[PDB]
Design a protein around this nucleic acid. Structure first.
Ligand SMILES: [K+]
Ligand SMILES: [K+]
Ligand SMILES: [K+]
Ligand SMILES: [K+]
Ligand SMILES: [K+]
Ligand SMILES: [K+]
Ligand SMILES: [K+]
Ligand SMILES: [Mg+2]
Ligand SMILES: [Mg+2]
Ligand SMILES: [Mg+2]
Ligand SMILES: [Mg+2]
Ligand SMILES: [Mg+2]
Ligand SMILES: [Mg+2]
Ligand SMILES: [Mg+2]
Ligand SMILES: [Mg+2]
Ligand SMILES: [Mg+2]
Ligand SMILES: [Mg+2]
Ligand SMILES: [Mg+2]
Ligand SMILES: [Mg+2]
Ligand SMILES: [Mg+2]
Ligand SMILES: [Mg+2]
Ligand SMILES: [Mg+2]
Ligand SMILES: [Mg+2]
Ligand SMILES: [Mg+2]
Ligand SMILES: [Mg+2]
Ligand SMILES: [Mg+2]
Ligand SMILES: [Mg+2]
Ligand SMILES: [Mg+2]
Ligand SMILES: [Mg+2]
Ligand SMILES: [Mg+2]
Ligand SMILES: [Mg+2]
Ligand SMILES: [Mg+2]
Ligand SMILES: [Mg+2]
Ligand SMILES: [Mg+2]
Ligand SMILES: [Mg+2]
Ligand SMILES: [Mg+2]
Ligand SMILES: [Mg+2]
Ligand SMILES: [Mg+2]
Ligand SMILES: [Mg+2]
Lengths: 419, 200, 64, 166
RNA sequence: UAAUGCGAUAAUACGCAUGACGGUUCAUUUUUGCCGUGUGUGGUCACGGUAAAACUUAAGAAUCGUCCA
RNA sequence: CGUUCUUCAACCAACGGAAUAAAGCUACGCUAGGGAUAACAGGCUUAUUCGCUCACAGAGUUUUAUCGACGAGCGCGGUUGGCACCUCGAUGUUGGAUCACCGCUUCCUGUAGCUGCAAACGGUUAUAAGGGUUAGACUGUUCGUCUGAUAAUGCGGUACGUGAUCUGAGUUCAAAGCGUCGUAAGACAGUUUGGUUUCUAUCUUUGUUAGCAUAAGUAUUACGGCGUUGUGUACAGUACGAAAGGAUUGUUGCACAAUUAAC
RNA sequence: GUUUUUACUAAUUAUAAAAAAGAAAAGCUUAACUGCAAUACAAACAAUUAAAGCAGGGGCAUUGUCGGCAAUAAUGCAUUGAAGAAAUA
RNA sequence: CCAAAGGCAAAGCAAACGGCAGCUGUAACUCUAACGGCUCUAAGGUAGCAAAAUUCCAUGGCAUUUAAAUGAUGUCCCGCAUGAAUGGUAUAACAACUUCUUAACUGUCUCUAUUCUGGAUUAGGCGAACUUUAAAUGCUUGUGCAGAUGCAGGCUAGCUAACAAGGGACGAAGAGAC
RNA sequence: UAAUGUGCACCAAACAACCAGGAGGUGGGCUUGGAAGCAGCCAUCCUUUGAAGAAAGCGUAAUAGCUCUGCUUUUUGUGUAACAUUACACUACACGCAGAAAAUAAAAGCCGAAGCUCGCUUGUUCAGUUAAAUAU
RNA sequence: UAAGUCAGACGCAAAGCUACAAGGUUUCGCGUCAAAAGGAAAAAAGUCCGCCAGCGAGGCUAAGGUACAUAAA
RNA sequence: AAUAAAUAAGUUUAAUACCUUUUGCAGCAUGGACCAGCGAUUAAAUGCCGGUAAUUAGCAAAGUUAAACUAACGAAAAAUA
C-alpha cells in the first residue's frame, strides 16, 4: 500500500518543444512575449510549425519591444533576432499575402534595418502582381503601412509606385484623413510623383474633411501641401492655416513648433503670432527633441521675435540643447539615486545637426564669449567638450563651418568657453 | 482506513494553512533560489548540424507532342519518394503521389547513387555529384480498391473501411553521368522535343 | 517465469524449466552491464554538480 | 526500507519490540522435561530456516554431529536415531541430546471432506536450523564418532557433518 | 550535588569521609552475520536498517569490600 | 377529541427487527432452469495402497542359503480417499455370452548363476512375453468354498474393453406382504413375489467384389502378412545313492492331443 | 462526586495502564443534573465514539474539579400501547 | 392393562384407536439357577410358533440329499425387531401363483450339419421416412473447456462405387425423470 | 556409483609386487576332563633385539600349519564418507517414435515484431503602439 | 454516471486451512488475462518481448537466434 | 472453414465457421437444410435534468384566472483647500 516514504520532492525540469496540439496558441504566445530573448525561445520551440502568418507577426512585434527602449541604440538581441527573421522571410518570400507583407515591412523599418534589394523586389512583386487584384482586398490599415513601409526603406522603383497609385486612386475619397496624410507624405518624398494626377487627386480628397486630422498628421499635411502646391490651386493650405489659428492652444508642443515654421516659410507670419508662441514654447521647451529645437529656433528667428527680459526663450533653448547633446539627464537622476555607475545609453547626434544648430545660434545675434554669463555660453561649452571626443569625425570643411559660427558669436581666441 | 470513502484529510490541512497565511504575515521575504534564477535556455549543448542532400525532383519543361524512345546500354540507381529504383531509358515506375507536377512535364532527378555500363561502374558515397536522370510525368491515378476489414468473434465488433491509394507514374527518358562503352553509342535521335520553361 | 512442474497446463516441457543456453547467458550479462553503467554515470554527475542550476525553457510553463 | 507512515515514526504504540520467532537469530535453549502440550499449533511453528549464529560451538563434549540443512523431524525418527547411536557407541559413553519433539501436528481420518474445523493431534515434530548441532559425545575416540555419523546418515533426510572441539 | 550521600535509637548537633587496589551492574558506521524493499532462470544485482535479535576491545560512572600493597 | 415535552413496556436472540399468527408427506407427481451443484466414466493430486534402493538390527548359527526390522529417499497410477475442471435442449448400470489389441511386475513350456544342491523333489536371483492358461456342484454375482483331471490353471490396462451385436438374474418407477420407526400422510439407507430393452449406415474404420484408368505373359530382388506347439513313452532301474528312491543329454525314435491347412 | 492523612502499590475473562497517580482509612455530599455546543475520530446509509466552551441550579475545596464507574463487552430501529405534565379545541 | 393425553358413554368402553421392564445372589467338581433381594409402572408378552415372506453377526450348529451343497427338508433356540379377531397354530380339496425333487423325453447343450417355404439378394414398373451451419471428411503421439477427421511433430500417393460387418463421428429420436 | 577441480596428508622411497623370520620368560596367571593365539576371564608386562600383537583371520577334541599388524634387497606419484561443480540411477506415454545430424565460438559482425523510424493517405486538435523631409 | 458491474482466472512471492498435496480452498503485494491483435518457446487465454487509424517489394531494433528443415558467423 | 498473399504459372508460404453463454469454447457445450415474405423500448398523462426560443402565460376584450417577486446591519468620503 505504501511504497515510498517522505514528502514528494520537486518535479524534474525537462526541456520541451511545442506539440502539434498547441499550434493555434503561437500567435497568443508572440503577443505575451515581453523581451527579445523570450520571443527567440518561443520561435525556436515552434520551429516545426511556423507559417508565413507567424513570421510576419514576429517582425511586427519587434516594433512593440523596441518602443520600451526609446532614447537608446537598438539592442544587440533585437538585431540578432532580426537577422534570423530575415532568413525566414526569404524562404516564404512568395507565400505572403498583401496584408502580411505590410506588417513585415513596418516592423523591419521601425527597427531601422535595411532589407536586401532583392527581397524588396520580390516583396514588391507580391503586392502588384495580377494587376493589383489583391490591392482591392487590402483594408485601410494595410494601405497605410504599405505606403509608409516601402517609402521608409528607400524603395525607388518607378513602375511599382505607378501601378500602386493607379489601384488606390479610386479609393482615396473614402479613406480616413490620417491615411490620406500618409499618402501625401510619400508623394512629396517621391520626386517623379510631384505633378501627377494622383498627387492632385490626393489634395482634393483631403480638403473636404480636415476636422478629423490628428495633431501629428495635421502638421505633416501642412508641410507636404506647402511643398507640393505653393499656390493654393485647391483650398487646402488656406483651410489648414485656419485650423492652426483656431486650435493653436490645444495642439501639443511638437506640432505647434513644426506648424509655426511652415507658416514662416509661407511668409504669413505676424508679430502677434510670434508673441503668442513664445510663452508656450518657453514653458515646455524641455519636451522638444533636438530636431524640434532646430525647427523652433529657425521659426522664431525668421518671425523676427527678439529676446525679452520676461521670456528669454533663446537662453532657455540654448541650455536645453546643451542637455540633449551632453545627455546630462541620466547623470542627474543617478546623482539623486546615489549610484553613479548606472549605465547610460545615448543616441549621439550627427555632426551635420551640430553645424546647423551652431549657425542658427550665430544668426540669432547673441554673444557667448565676451560676457562671463551669456545666453549661448553653455551650448558652445558643451560643443567643445563633445568635439574633443569626436576629433576623428571632424573634417576640414566641418572645422571651417564651426570656426565661422565661433567667430560670429564672438569666440575666436582658440580657448575653451568660460563655463 | 478500512472504509473505501475517499479521504478528506488533504482538504482539512489546506484550510488550516490558508487561514494562518491569510491572517499571520511571514517573517522572511526573499528566497535566494528565486533571486539568482537565470534566463531560460533551449539546451546546454551545441546543436547538431544537419547533413545536406541533393534535390529530389524539379520541373524543367513540358512535352510538345508524340515521340518515340529507343533502348540504350546504361543504367543507374535513383532515390525518389522514400524508395530506390534501378532505371534505364524507356522504363516505367510507380511511386507515391508527387505534388507540384503535371502530366506531360519533364522532371530532373539528382539523388543518383549508382551509375553503370558494360565497361565501367561509378559508386556514390552516398550520392554522385554531377549526375541526373530525366523522366516524363504520365499519370496521377487512384490505385485499385483495398478492402480493410476487422472483426472479433463473439464480441459484436465489426469494422469495414475501403480505401483507394494515390500514386504517380513516370517514364524514364535519359540517364546522364556515364558514357556508354565503346561501340554502344546510340547514333540517332532518341527523345522528345522539350520546351524549356525553367531558367534560374 | 514458471517453476511449477505439476498440473495439466504444460507451461514447461517434460522435465521442468530448461537450463539457459550460451546465448541466453550472454544476453543476461549485457543487461546487467547496462544497469551497472547507469549507476556509474549518476556517480559522476553527483561529483561534478555546479553551484547554480540551469533553467530550461518549456512552452507550457511560459503560457501559464 | 520500512513500511510505516510519518505519524508512526513519531507516535508508535508498539513500545515493547520483540523480534518474531521466525527470523530471530537467538540459539534455541536446551531441552527440558516438561510434559507435551495438548494445544494445537500453526504449521509455521514447526519450520524455521534461518541459519545459526556464526559463533556456535560445542558446549559440553569433544565431538558432535551438526545439520548442514534445515528439516522437520518427527518423534519416531528421533527414537530410532537414539537407539542406533546408543548401540553403536557403547554402554560406557557420554551422550548429550540437544533436540526434542514438542510441536504437535494434526491429521484427519480417511473419508472426511474439507471443513468442519481443525483436526486432532497425531504426532510431534521439531524444527532444525542449518548448522545446528544435534548430538555431542565424550569418553570416545574420533574413529568411534565417525562410525556413529555413518550409522545415522542413511536414517535422516538432511546432510550431516562432524564437529570437533579445539 | 561536601548546603552531597549513607547510618543498626536514625531523628541528624554526632558517626563513616573526595585517594588507592579488587570484584560486580551499566572506535575508519568496532565489523561480520542477519533482516526489509526493488529487480530477478530461483542471486557474479542495488540501497537502506538492526536505539528489534547473535557478535570486539576499551575508557569512564554507580554502589560494595578493604589498616593499603 | 387532538398536539408537544418528560418517560417506559411487549414480541423482535433468524438480534436492520414487520403479509397479525402459524407443522409435515409425495415411489402418483407436474412446470421453469443449472454441468453456477451431486451419483457412473475421464482429468488433476498421491495422503493411503503397491514396488524398488539404502539400512544388515534381529532370527538361522561361520556365511546376505533363506526369512526379515526401526528409520530415510525415490518411483507407479491398478486400493481406500480429496478437489468440482468437461458433459443435465440425456457421455445407457453390475455380471456373463460372442470377438479382441497391448504391458511384464513370468503360473506352465525356455536360458545362466548361487544354495543349509548326493539323486529325486525344491529354494532364490538375472534374463525371456512365441504358444498355452481345464470340465463341473452352490451363489444374480465379481469374489469365495469344494470335486475329478491337467505341463500349468498368471496379474493388469483398454469409458473398472465390448447392449446403433445378444442377454436382463441383481440394482434403480407404478402393485402387494412382513418386521421396525411415525398421531397420521408415509419412510427403511431391511427383506420377499411381479414388472415394455427402438434405429433401413451419409462420412471414417474393416472384410470381399466389379467397373474405369499405360498391351499381355514369365518374373530375381524388395516390401507386407503368418509364427516354427504340448504331453506320455523307449534308449535306463543306467549315473547318483548304505538302503530307499531315482535322472541328465538329444537338428533323437514312436503313439497321442490341441491349432492350422485342405480333402 | 470531592477534600485530608500514609510503615501500602494490588486486582480483573485477559493485559508490561498509572507515583502528584491509585488503593485503603476518616469526613461532608447526589454532577448517576436542566438548556445548548466549535471541532474531530470513524463510517455505504441508519445509527455508534471523543469533546474545548456558554447560561442556570448545586456538591466538596477555596479557586481546582464533578454532565457516573482505569480503559477495551453487559444490547434492539420504526410502528402500536401505557404513564406524568403542559397548550389548544 | 381405561393410568397420562384424546374420542365416545349411563362416571363406563380394548373383537374401539393403543401398550404389554430392569439389576443382583444362589445346588457335591464344574456349569446352570429350581429358589432369594431391590427399583419402577396403568400393565409389565400367557399359550403357541420360531434361523421364518419377520435374523444385523450369518453362507448359525447337527442330520438327510450330491463325486462336489450360500440350495431344499427336518431339528436346536429370549425372537437385533415373534405373538394370539390390524387374530395365533394346523388343515382334505383347489391354483396359467413362488420354491425344491423324481420319472421320461429331447439340437438346451458337447458341436453342429443338411434341407423346404418366405424375405433379403438380381431385373422391369411404381415410389416413403428419421436427418442436414458449410465441406474436397486418413493413422499415431503431443497439445487443449482437462478423451481431436480439421491445431503441432512423426507417417500416409491409382479413381468412383457395389455386397457385407457395426469400433468412432462424446451417432439419431424426446429443452434429464436422478 | 562415476568424472573433473580445490584443500589437506605422505624420490630420507610414498604406492603395487617378488625374495625371508613372525622368536624366547611363555604353553603368562586363572577357569578347565583339554586352552598354548583364537570355549571363557585377569593381564597386555619382560627379554632377544633382523622383525613380532601375551598372535588379525581360517581350523585342529589340544597339536602342527598358513598367512596378517610389523620385516632387507628388488623393480617402483599415491591416498583422502574433506569440500565444490557437472551429469546419471532406485522398473507400466500398457494403440506407435520429438526431425535429420552432431567429438571446436558467449568472436569482428549479422538475422529477427503490426515496437521505433522513412514516403504517401484519413479523422482530431486575432492584432495592428511606428513618422527616421535638412523646405524659408 | 439515478449508467453498467456485485459468478472471476492464473504466474511469481507470503500466511491460515488440507498432508509445508491438488489446475484445491481462504486472505494479502505486484503483474497479465478477462476486454489485447503482432513476435519467441511445438500447439500455446494467465509465462518472456511488446499495445494494431490506413497503404508501400524502404531502414534500425526487442525477447530469441546465427552448418539442414529455417533468415543470419 | 475450401480461402488469402504472391508467382518465371511449374508452384510456394500463411491459415482450426458464425452466434449464444462463460474464469476459460475449433469445441466432444447451445441454435440454424436453403430462398422469398412477416417478426420485437411504441402511445398518453405527470415529474426531474440538459439544449433552443419568447420576454410572464391563458382567457376575455379597460377585467379577470395561473404562476413568480416581496427587509437584509442604510457600512461609501477617493477635496494637491
Ligand atoms: K434475519
Ligand atoms: K448429465
Ligand atoms: K517363465
Ligand atoms: K382392527
Ligand atoms: K394362479
Ligand atoms: K458404426
Ligand atoms: K441451397
Ligand atoms: Mg494438459
Ligand atoms: Mg539481445
Ligand atoms: Mg427480516
Ligand atoms: Mg422437467
Ligand atoms: Mg464445473
Ligand atoms: Mg472454485
Ligand atoms: Mg522380467
Ligand atoms: Mg481384464
Ligand atoms: Mg465396462
Ligand atoms: Mg456399442
Ligand atoms: Mg408401492
Ligand atoms: Mg406394515
Ligand atoms: Mg404405531
Ligand atoms: Mg407372471
Ligand atoms: Mg453518517
Ligand atoms: Mg466551582
Ligand atoms: Mg468522571
Ligand atoms: Mg402383525
Ligand atoms: Mg389372516
Ligand atoms: Mg425377392
Ligand atoms: Mg488426443
Ligand atoms: Mg490427427
Ligand atoms: Mg433441462
Ligand atoms: Mg506504431
Ligand atoms: Mg450477490
Ligand atoms: Mg461474489
Ligand atoms: Mg483455483
Ligand atoms: Mg465476461
Ligand atoms: Mg541489423
Ligand atoms: Mg539459410
Ligand atoms: Mg464451466
Ligand atoms: Mg440442430
Amino acid at each position: 500500500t505504501i511504497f515510498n516514504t517522505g514528502v514528494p520532492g520537486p518535479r524534474p525540469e525537462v526541456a520541451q518543444k511545442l506539440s502539434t496540439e498547441y499550434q493555434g496558441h503561437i500567435l497568443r504566445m508572440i503577443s505575451l512575449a515581453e523581451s527579445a530573448s523570450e520571443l527567440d525561445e518561443v520561435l525556436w520551440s515552434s520551429k516545426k510549425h511556423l507559417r508565413p502568418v507567424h513570421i510576419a507577426r514576429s517582425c511586427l512585434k519587434l516594433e512593440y519591444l523596441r518602443t520600451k527602449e526609446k532614447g537608446r541604440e537598438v539592442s544587440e538581441p533585437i538585431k540578432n533576432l532580426a537577422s534570423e527573421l530575415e532568413n525566414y522571410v526569404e524562404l516564404y518570400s512568395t507565400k505572403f499575402t498583401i496584408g502580411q507583407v505590410s506588417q513585415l515591412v513596418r516592423g523591419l523599418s521601425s527597427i531601422r534595418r535595411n532589407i536586401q534589394p532583392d527581397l524588396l523586389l520580390k516583396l514588391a512583386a507580391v503586392v502588384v502582381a495580377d494587376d493589383g487584384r489583391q490591392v482591392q482586398l487590402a483594408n485601410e490599415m494595410d494601405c497605410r503601412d504599405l505606403f509608409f513601409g516601402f517609402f521608409s526603406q528607400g524603395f525607388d522603383n518607378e513602375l511599382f509606385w505607378k501601378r500602386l497609385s493607379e489601384s488606390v486612386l479610386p479609393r482615396l475619397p473614402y479613406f480616413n484623413a490620417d491615411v490620406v496624410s500618409t499618402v501625401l507624405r510619400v508623394v512629396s518624398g517621391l520626386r517623379f510623383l510631384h505633378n501627377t494626377e494622383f498627387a492632385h487627386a490626393t489634395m482634393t480628397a483631403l480638403v473636404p474633411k480636415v476636422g478629423d486630422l490628428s495633431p501629428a498628421r495635421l502638421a505633416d499635411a501642412f508641410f507636404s501641401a506647402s511643398l507640393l502646391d505653393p499656390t493654393d490651386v485647391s483650398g487646402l493650405n488656406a483651410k489648414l492655416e485656419e485650423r492652426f489659428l483656431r486650435e493653436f492652444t490645444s495642439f501639443p508642443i511638437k506640432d505647434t513648433v513644426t506648424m509655426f515654421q511652415t507658416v514662416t516659410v509661407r511668409r504669413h507670419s505676424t508679430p502677434e503670432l510670434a508673441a503668442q508662441v513664445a510663452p508656450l514654447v518657453a514653458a515646455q521647451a524641455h519636451q522638444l527633441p533636438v530636431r524640434h529645437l532646430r525647427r523652433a529656433l529657425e521659426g522664431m528667428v525668421t518671425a523676427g521675435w527678439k529676446d525679452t527680459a520676461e521670456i528669454p526663450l533663446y537662453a532657455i533653448l540654448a541650455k536645453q540643447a546643451a542637455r540633449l547633446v551632453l545627455g546630462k539627464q541620466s547623470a542627474a537622476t543617478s546623482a539623486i539615486l546615489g549610484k553613479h555607475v548606472d549605465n547610460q545609453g545615448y543616441q549621439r547626434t550627427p555632426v551635420q545637426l551640430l553645424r546647423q544648430l551652431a549657425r542658427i545660434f550665430a544668426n540669432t545675434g547673441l554673444k557667448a564669449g565676451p560676457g562671463a554669463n551669456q545666453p549661448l555660453a553653455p551650448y558652445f561649452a558643451a560643443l567643445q567638450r563633445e568635439l574633443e571626443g569626436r576629433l576623428a569625425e571632424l573634417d576640414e570643411q566641418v572645422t571651417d563651418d564651426f570656426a565661422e559660427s565661433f567667430k560670429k558669436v564672438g569666440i575666436a581666441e582658440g580657448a575653451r568657453v568660460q563655463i | 482506513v478500512r472504509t473505501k470513502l475517499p479521504s478528506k484529510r488533504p482538504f482539512l490541512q489546506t484550510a488550516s494553512h490558508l487561514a494562518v497565511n491569510s491572517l499571520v504575515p511571514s517573517v522572511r521575504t526573499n528566497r535566494w533560489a528565486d533571486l539568482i534564477k537565470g534566463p531560460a535556455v533551449r539546451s546546454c549543448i551545441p546543436e547538431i548540424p544537419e547533413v545536406p542532400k541533393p534535390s529530389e525532383y524539379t520541373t524543367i519543361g513540358t512535352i510538345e507532342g508524340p515521340y518515340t524512345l529507343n533502348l540504350e546500354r546504361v543504367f543507374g540507381v535513383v532515390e525518389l519518394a522514400g524508395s530506390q529504383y534501378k532505371v534505364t531509358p524507356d522504363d516505367v515506375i510507380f511511386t507515391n503521389l508527387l505534388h507540384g507536377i503535371e502530366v506531360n512535364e519533364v522532371v530532373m532527378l539528382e539523388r543518383v547513387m549508382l551509375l553503370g555500363s558494360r565497361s565501367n561502374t561509378i559508386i556514390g558515397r552516398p550520392y554522385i555529384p554531377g549526375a541526373c536522370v530525366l523522366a516524363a510525368v504520365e499519370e496521377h491515378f487512384l490505385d485499385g480498391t483495398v478492402h480493410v476489414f476487422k472483426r472479433k468473434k463473439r464480441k459484436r465488433y465489426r469494422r469495414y473501411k475501403p480505401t483507394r491509394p494515390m500514386m504517380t507514374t513516370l517514364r524514364i527518358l535519359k540517364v546522364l553521368g556515364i558514357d556508354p562503352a565503346p561501340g554502344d553509342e546510340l547514333g540517332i535521335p532518341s527523345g522528345p522535343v522539350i520546351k524549356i520553361t525553367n531558367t534560374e | 517465469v514458471v517453476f511449477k512442474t505439476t498440473g495439466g497446463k504444460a507451461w514447461n516441457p517434460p522435465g521442468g524449466l530448461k537450463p539457459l543456453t550460451n546465448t541466453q547467458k550472454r544476453s543476461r550479462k549485457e543487461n546487467l552491464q547496462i544497469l551497472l553503467r547507469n549507476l556509474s554515470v549518476l556517480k559522476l554527475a553527483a561529483e561534478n554538480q555546479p553551484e547554480v542550476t540551469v533553467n530550461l525553457f518549456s512552452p507550457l510553463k511560459f503560457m501559464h | 526500507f520500512r513500511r510505516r507512515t510519518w505519524p508512526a515514526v513519531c507516535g508508535s504504540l508498539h513500545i515493547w519490540k520483540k523480534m518474531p520467532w521466525r527470523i530471530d537469530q537467538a540459539p534455541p535453549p536446551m531441552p527440558d522435561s516438561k510434559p507435551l502440550t495438548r494445544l494445537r499449533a500453526k504449521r509455521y511453528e514447526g519450520i524455521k530456516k534461518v541459519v545459526m549464529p556464526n559463533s556456535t560451538q560445542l558446549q559440553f563434549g569433544l565431538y558432535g554431529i551438526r545439520s548442514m540443512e534445515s528439516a522437520r523431524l518427527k518423534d519416531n525418527t528421533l527414537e530410532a536415531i537414539r537407539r542406533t547411536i546408543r548401540r553403536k557407541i557403547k554402554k560406557t559413553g557420554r551422550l548429550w541430546i540437544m533436540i526434542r519433539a514438542t510441536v504437535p501436528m494434526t491429521k484427519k481420518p480417511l473419508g472426511i471432506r474439507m471443513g468442519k474445523g481443525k483436526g486432532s493431534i497425531d504426532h510431534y515434530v521439531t524444527p532444525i536450523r542449518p548448522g545446528q548441532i544435534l548430538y555431542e559425545f565424550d569418553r570416545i575416540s574420533r574413529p568411534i564418532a565417525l562410525q556413529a555419523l555413518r550409522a545415522i546418515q542413511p536414517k535422516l533426510p538432511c546432510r550431516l557433518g562432524l564437529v570437533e572441539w579445539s
